[PDB]
Design a protein around this ligand. Structure first.
Ligand SMILES: [Cl-]
Ligand SMILES: [Cl-]
Ligand code: NA
Length: 129
């Protein structure tokens, strides 16, 4: 599923992400735009052989099982394929664990480089929430 901007914002707010660990909703929408272009089916292979999955590009080296990243962990206890669903519940729940792990949203490279320090409220401007 390719989300609209305000549609995704409402779903994330309906999933508890607004101000989660201090990150306003616009941070999460900005991250999803530049990680996946709001596409739940996005995948990208990394040099080390791990793969990133879904609307927030969660990496199989630590967070999910895809059967093809030897020596990796599955800290969200899910198959990586579950992160590609049109229902974003599994991605949101796993993102809550990532952002709690000490490094905040710096875990998402595109957030650090394209969202951090910008007017992220602009990403939810005009949405009914
Ligand atoms: Cl915001
Ligand atoms: Cl933080
Ligand atoms: Na894994």
């Amino acid at each position: 599923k390719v989300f609209g901007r305000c549609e995704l914002a409402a779903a994330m707010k309906r999933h508890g992400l607004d101000n989660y660990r201090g990150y306003s909703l616009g941070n999460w929408v900005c991250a999803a735009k530049f990680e996946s272009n709001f596409n739940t089916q996005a995948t990208n292979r990394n040099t080390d052989g791990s793969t990133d999955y879904g609307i927030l590009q969660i990496n199989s080296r630590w967070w999910c099982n895809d059967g093809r990243t030897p020596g990796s962990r599955n800290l969200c206890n899910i198959p990586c394929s579950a992160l590609l669903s049109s229902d974003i519940t599994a991605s949101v729940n796993c993102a809550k664990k990532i952002v709690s792990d000490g490094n905040g949203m710096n875990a998402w490279v595109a957030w650090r480089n394209r969202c951090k320090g910008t007017d992220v409220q602009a990403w939810i401007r005009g949405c009914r929430l």
